Amino acid sequence: GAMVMRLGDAAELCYNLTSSYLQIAAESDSIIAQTQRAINTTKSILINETFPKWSPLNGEISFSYNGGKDCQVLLLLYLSCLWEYYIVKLSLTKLPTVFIDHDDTFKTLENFIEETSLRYSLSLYESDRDKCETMAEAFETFLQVFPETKAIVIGIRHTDPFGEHLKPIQKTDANWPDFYRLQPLLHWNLANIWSFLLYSNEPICELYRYGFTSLGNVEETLPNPHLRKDKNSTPLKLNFEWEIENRYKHNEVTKAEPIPIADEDLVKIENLHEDYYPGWYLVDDKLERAGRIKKK
Ligand SMILES: Cc1cc2nc3c(=O)[nH]c(=O)nc-3n(C[C@H](O)[C@H](O)[C@H](O)COP(=O)(O)O)c2cc1C
Ligand SMILES: Nc1ncnc2c1ncn2[C@@H]1O[C@H](COP(=O)(O)CP(=O)(O)OP(=O)(O)O)[C@@H](O)[C@H]1O
């Protein structure tokens, strides 16, 4: 449209695309069916266990966001649940959001966080990228600025490093500033993330198109070697042709347009002299972090 969506437009959009996904007739042994189950579990955590305890309206909840596929899927679900909770169940101009910036963050990701903060009406606190501090330390500063904060939404999954023992709702550790971690994406597998994200028709970080499946820092992170194209390997098959073809249609209000990667990231991807399937050709969680510079 001629104007960016208001938060109410964004939340309603997320509710409608999520309801739509949930309406797909899928076989019980399918990725989509599993993803529908994952959504319903997420919803229940937000609507039944989170929102009755902490207000998503008054700053008590902040949303941790760094433009990655997982926090992005979680954001869409969170926005969906806000609309469901207040409009549909009858139980704010911007969403309180926190991003801890670093000096080695991908430029494409920086641009994506900028672009989506506008699209999703995020009220984004951004830590100083040029300060040398731990995440804990950045979050302690954040909490001094917003001492109303009781809880923070995080898009961590069980398959992530240190994810095994995590719970949907739990306090931070002794060495962190004191708040509840709200972790409603824990049960999501990689195939579910891709399925829902491609069906959503939301713009996603362009690094994924170029074979990245995990976004660490600019030095350490490579396109996934399991996605490298070659003439003598069995070619990879796409699990998400339907979701792409049938992705959630937009109108004038909800219309989005595509962005190429940052120029400097394209350069590093050309320098490689290898080509890759996009990230959504990887559905094996064990291999999600395969694309990393060898160390030690
Ligand atoms: C909002 C939020 C809260 C977190 N709380 C904890 C925590 O209490 N304990 C923990 O081990 N990791 C926690 N993490 C994950 C860590 O930040 C990550 O695993 C890593 O330890 C941070 O690296 P750094 O300490 O070198 O900056 C949290 C992450 C986020 C985004
Ligand atoms: N620098 C940062 N600022 C704010 N939140 C962050 C953060 N780093 C991590 N998080 C939180 O921790 C969860 C996992 O972090 P990341 O792996 O860095 C991005 P992602 O969304 O998981 O996609 P990725 O797995 O493709 O990198 C995120 O969903 C986000 O909620």
Ligand SMILES: [Mg+2]
């Ligand atoms: Mg992740």
